[PDB]
Amino acid sequence: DCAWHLGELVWCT
Amino acid sequence: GPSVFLFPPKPKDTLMISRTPEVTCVVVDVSHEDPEVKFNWYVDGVEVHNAKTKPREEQYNSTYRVVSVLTVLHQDWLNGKEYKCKVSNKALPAPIEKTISKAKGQPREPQVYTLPPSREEMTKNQVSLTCMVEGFYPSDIAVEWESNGQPENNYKTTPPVLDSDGSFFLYSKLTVDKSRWQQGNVFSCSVMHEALHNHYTQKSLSLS
Amino acid sequence: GPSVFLFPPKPKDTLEASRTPEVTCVVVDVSHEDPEVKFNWYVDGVEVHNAKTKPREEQYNSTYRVVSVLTVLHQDWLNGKEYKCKVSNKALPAPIEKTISKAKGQPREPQVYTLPPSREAMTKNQVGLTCLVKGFYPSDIAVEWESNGQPENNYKTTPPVLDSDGSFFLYSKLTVDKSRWQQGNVFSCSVMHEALHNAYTQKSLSL
Ligand SMILES: *[C@@H]1O[C@H](CO[C@@H]2O[C@@H](C)[C@@H](O)[C@@H](O)[C@@H]2O)[C@@H](O[C@@H]2O[C@H](CO)[C@@H](O[C@@H]3O[C@H](CO[C@H]4O[C@H](CO)[C@@H](O)[C@H](O)[C@@H]4O[C@@H]4O[C@H](CO)[C@@H](O[C@@H]5O[C@H](CO)[C@H](O)[C@H](O)[C@H]5O)[C@H](O)[C@H]4NC(C)=O)[C@@H](O)[C@H](O[C@H]4O[C@H](CO)[C@@H](O)[C@H](O)[C@@H]4O)[C@@H]3O)[C@H](O)[C@H]2NC(C)=O)[C@H](O)[C@H]1NC(C)=O
Ligand SMILES: *[C@@H]1O[C@H](CO[C@@H]2O[C@@H](C)[C@@H](O)[C@@H](O)[C@@H]2O)[C@@H](O[C@@H]2O[C@H](CO)[C@@H](O[C@@H]3O[C@H](CO[C@H]4O[C@H](CO)[C@@H](O)[C@H](O)[C@@H]4O[C@@H]4O[C@H](CO)[C@@H](O[C@@H]5O[C@H](CO)[C@H](O)[C@H](O)[C@H]5O)[C@H](O)[C@H]4NC(C)=O)[C@@H](O)[C@H](O[C@H]4O[C@H](CO)[C@@H](O)[C@H](O)[C@@H]4O)[C@@H]3O)[C@H](O)[C@H]2NC(C)=O)[C@H](O)[C@H]1NC(C)=O
């Protein structure tokens, strides 16, 4: 899955 | 003669795949007689040639500032690769070599807790929302705040402090108008750190 | 030539009446050819003659460390008096002068708030109890913990951080065995700062 921060991609596994 | 300072990338840049982390090799006290500076970059002893020199900058104290920037790969930085900048200048008897890498040691996941304002603070015009971040290694971290999908800027965060168990902790304090707290508005603490799932967690706080 | 660093008193020394705060004039890189250092002390421009010189100390790098200590009066320090250490040595073309004093600006009383561990924090063997100290100026402060009249020493405290209103804040974190917290024991965050009543306050926390 993916992490987002204020509509910005942080990281996905 | 010239002095060299080699800086790591920003934690946010290393932890966000949508950002571009870079290491910076700064040379100061470069004379007007010999402004020519040569850089050699090495990634784990292996020379690389994709570095970029910034516009030369006059300092008006008789010296130039000369900067070389190297893009680094996210995983390379996080896997602990060493970056070496070798600086040569006519005023230097020998080349100056500096080295940076991520701090050594098994990464530890930050435990993130939000603490509401104390009852005793409820007389004030504004209240303190606390984000407590502990048990993290290495100390590279970013903390930010949000509400209603919008960033909240009225916060200050402590430097990381080395804890007795060898991890680090810090606190972030967001200051909000008391009414916003009383009205049930949800606030959120965002933490970016390598040992977190997807480099990220978000913890929420509202009046219960 | 040699280098001079002038140090303020420890905050706990200025804040406890029975303690003896002092300013410390450290001189480093003093040569073997001229180990003699003349000190002159000035309190608000007025020369004082009651400083003490510490034992001379050879490092290793073929340098001497020479230290002068001047005891400071509690009221003097609090009134913001300026302490000047002038250092003369033969390896110096000019006498080096340094000043320190308490940071200037109106003192502001800290607000001390104790914050209980989150529910999420209860899964582990030990828990962090939090003391938020904020709204204080100057940044000179001492924070300790206690329980049932006994000092609790298993805490770390952040440095003071400058806040957006120009005061300072910090957090201190005391780590206790979870069972002690579960069993209702009271823990106390104690804060020393000049703008507090009696330069002391204590706030309690329990489950
Ligand atoms: C002539 O003037 C120049 C310029 O000086 C400036 O102008 C004058 C007029 C005054 O106003 C000064 O106050 C100005 O600085 C003088 O050059 C200075 O020399 C100093 C050494 O003599 C040197 O000190 C060392 O600084 C290190 C930290 O530097 C940081 O932080 C300071 C602010 O605190 C900042 O000014 C520096 O530029 C530098 O800032 C970082 O820049 C890096 C590189 O760009 C950034 O990292 C990158 O950021 C980008 C995005 O921006 C991106 O994310 C990249 O991925 C990332 O890599 C980073 O963001 C910046 N950080 C911050 C916090 O802002 C200290 O660590 C170092 O201390 C160590 O060494 C000491 C020994 O000297 C030890 O005592 C100590 O224990 C430490 O081990 C030094 O103190 C100054 O940095 C330098 N100034 C500049 C601007 O470069 C020059 O000396 C003078 N010559 C003469 C003859 O007088
Ligand atoms: C030969 O060696 C000597 C000694 O070096 C040591 O031994 C060798 C073998 C090595 O192992 C070294 O690592 C050892 O340090 C060298 O002497 C050193 O010169 C340094 C460079 O000039 C100098 O750096 C400056 O340090 C300032 C802070 O000093 C603090 O902290 C350091 C490190 O933590 C510590 O080493 C110092 O002793 C000093 O500690 C404080 O002492 C004061 C005064 O006693 C304490 O205050 C008192 O506390 C008591 C409690 O008992 C009481 O309450 C009193 O009331 C109170 O006054 C205080 O608590 C101590 N604090 C701490 C944290 O420990 C820096 O501020 C300064 O940085 C700034 O300098 C410039 C400013 O313009 C800027 O460039 C820069 O940006 C900074 O702002 C300096 O870096 C070292 O202090 C000094 N070391 C010692 C031990 O004295 C010598 O240089 C070397 N020569 C050669 C040719 O190689």
Layout of strands and helices, then pairs:
The complex is a heterotrimer of chains A (13), B (208) and C (207).
Chain A: E1 2-4, E2 9-12
Antiparallel strand pairs in A: 1-2
Chain B: E1 3-7, H1 11-15, E2 22-30, E3 37-43, E4 46-48, E5 52-53, E6 57-58, E7 64-71, H2 74-78, E8 83-89, E9 96-100, E10 111-115, E11 126-136, E12 142-147, E13 150-152, E14 155-157, E15 161-162, E16 168-177, H3 178-182, E17 187-192, E18 200-205
Chain C: E1 3-7, H1 11-15, E2 22-30, E3 38-43, E4 46-48, E5 52-53, E6 57-58, E7 64-71, H2 74-78, E8 83-88, E9 96-100, E10 111-115, E11 126-136, E12 142-147, E13 150-152, E14 155-157, E15 161-162, E16 168-177, H3 178-182, E17 187-192, E18 200-205
Bound molecules: a molecule of 8 linked components (NAG-NAG-BMA-MAN-NAG-GAL-MAN-FUC) (2 copies).
Residues 3, 5, 7, 9-10, 13, 22-24, 26, 28-29, 59, 61, 63, 65 of chain B line the site of a molecule of 8 linked components (NAG-NAG-BMA-MAN-NAG-GAL-MAN-FUC).
Structure description:
The complex is a heterotrimer of chains A (13), B (208) and C (207). Chain A has 13 residues and is mainly beta. Chain A has strands at residues 2-4, 9-12. Chain A starts with a strand and ends with a strand. By secondary structure, chain B is mainly beta. Chain B is built from three helices and 18 strands. In chain B, the strands form four sheets. In chain B, strands 1, 2, 5, 6 and 7 form a five-stranded antiparallel β-sheet that branches. In chain B, a hairpin with a 7-residue loop joins strand 17 (187-192) and strand 18. The radius of gyration of chain B is 22 Å and the shape is elongated. Chain B starts with a strand and ends with a strand. Chain C is mostly beta strands. Chain C has helices spanning 11-15, 74-78, 178-182; strands at residues 3-7, 22-30, 38-43, 46-48, 52-53, 57-58, 64-71, 83-88, 96-100, 111-115, 126-136, 142-147, 150-152, 155-157, 161-162, 168-177, 187-192, 200-205. In chain C, the strands form four sheets. In chain C, strands 1, 2, 5, 6 and 7 form a five-stranded antiparallel β-sheet that branches. Chain C is elongated. The termini of chain C are far apart. Classes of the chains: A mainly beta (13), B mainly beta (208), C mainly beta (207). The structure holds a molecule of 8 linked components (NAG-NAG-BMA-MAN-NAG-GAL-MAN-FUC) (2 copies). A molecule of 8 linked components (NAG-NAG-BMA-MAN-NAG-GAL-MAN-FUC) is lined by residues 3, 5, 7, 9-10, 13, 21-22, 24, 26, 28-29, 59-61, 63, 65 of chain C. Residues 3, 5, 7, 9-10, 13, 21-22, 24, 26, 28-29, 59-61, 63, 65 of chain C line the site of a molecule of 8 linked components (NAG-NAG-BMA-MAN-NAG-GAL-MAN-FUC). Chain B: This is Immunoglobulin heavy constant gamma 1. Chain B: Keywords: Adaptive immunity, Cell membrane, Chromosomal rearrangement, Disulfide bond, Glycoprotein, Immunity, Immunoglobulin, Immunoglobulin domain, Membrane, Secreted, Transmembrane, Transmembrane helix. Chain B: Immunoglobulins are composed of two identical heavy chains and two identical light chains; disulfide-linked. Interacts with FCGR1A; this interaction mediates IgG effector functions on monocytes. Interacts with FCGR2A and FCGR3A.
